[PDB]
Write a protein that binds this ligand. Structure first.
Ligand SMILES: Fc1cccc(F)c1-c1ccc2[nH]nc(-c3cncc(O[C@H]4CNCCC45CC5)n3)c2c1
Length: 273
């Protein structure tokens, strides 16, 4: 079942998401990632078209898993007595964006643009498929270093997308919007756009803009690195205090800072190889 089909490799890491291992699919030597989650730690359950009780993460991944490569593909999954196991794709060589930024510091704007654009395409794809990630951040983005392609990972804090208010949140606090901090209420799209402003700031400054609740609520952005005025403007727009003042995905991608994006392969050749 799981035992024979996959050869298990080293532990890649563990956290709120559970424990993830490197691995190889025995049949064709396909590189994979093997993710284990205990049932006790799963608060958010969902149901398949089969009518089967699984972790919401499995529901969400199946809804977004198609030829589009901006989201990590779910290859298979298994239930065990006290856990679920997910077999996910694994690009090779790969590095998560948090580690990449830690090593480089602030990213050049051309590179940040390419990366941010790909994140946007991936988030739009999720939203089109009825899925809200709810934990967009550097740690949850992988870079395929050869192709220069980014992938979203870890849908364990996600939800079905809806147009009504959310009153639960389980993502990362420092990426969460002021309406959550103050009222424990938010809407999907506008909260996602706030997290994208935090992410963009992180890319171009090398760290997140806010640490404490009061800074989030105050929403005053200070630039610690040299950042173009157009990029500063896009960031401040994404981080508007009122949800309804934030741009739509379309407005973000039509913003002047976002024009003439590099292709992924060009991005790898210039910045990654
Ligand atoms: F294979 C890898 C090597 C180095 C870093 C990586 F992130 C990976 C990798 C490759 C394929 C993957 N598919 N899914 C994951 C995954 C899923 N959920 C969580 C998660 O967390 C990792 C990324 N941020 C830091 C913590 C982490 C354990 C290392 N990865 C995945 C990861």
């Amino acid at each position: 079942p799981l035992e024979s089909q996959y050869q298990v490799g080293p532990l890649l890491g563990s956290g709120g998401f559970g424990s993830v291992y490197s691995g190889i699919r025995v049949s064709d030597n396909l590189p994979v990632a093997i993710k284990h989650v205990e049932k006790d730690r799963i608060s958010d359950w969902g149901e398949l078209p089969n009518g089967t009780r699984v972790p919401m993460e499995v529901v969400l991944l199946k809804k977004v898993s198609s030829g589009f490569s901006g989201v990590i593909r779910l290859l298979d999954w298994f239930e065990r007595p006290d856990s679920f196991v997910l077999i996910l794709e694994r690009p090779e060589p790969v590095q998560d964006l948090f580690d990449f930024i830690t090593e480089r510091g602030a990213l050049q704007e051309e590179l940040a643009r390419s990366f941010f654009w790909q994140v946007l395409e991936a988030v739009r794809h999720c939203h089109n498929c009825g899925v809200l990630h709810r934990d967009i951040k550097d740690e949850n983005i992988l870079i395929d270093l050869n192709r220069g392609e980014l992938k979203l990972i870890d849908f364990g804090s996600g939800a079905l997308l809806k147009d009504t208010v959310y009153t639960d949140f389980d993502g990362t606090r420092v990426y969460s919007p002021p309406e959550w901090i103050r009222y424990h209420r938010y809407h999907g799209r506008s909260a996602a756009v706030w997290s994208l402003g935090i992410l963009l700031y992180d890319m171009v400054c090398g760290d997140i803009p806010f640490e404490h609740d009061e800074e989030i609520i105050r929403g005053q952005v200070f630039f610690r690195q040299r950042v173009s005025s157009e990029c500063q403007h896009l960031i401040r727009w994404c981080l508007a205090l009122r949800p309804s003042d934030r741009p739509t995905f379309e407005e973000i991608q039509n913003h002047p800072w976002m024009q003439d994006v590099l292709l992924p392969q060009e991005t790898a050749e210039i910045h990654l190889h």
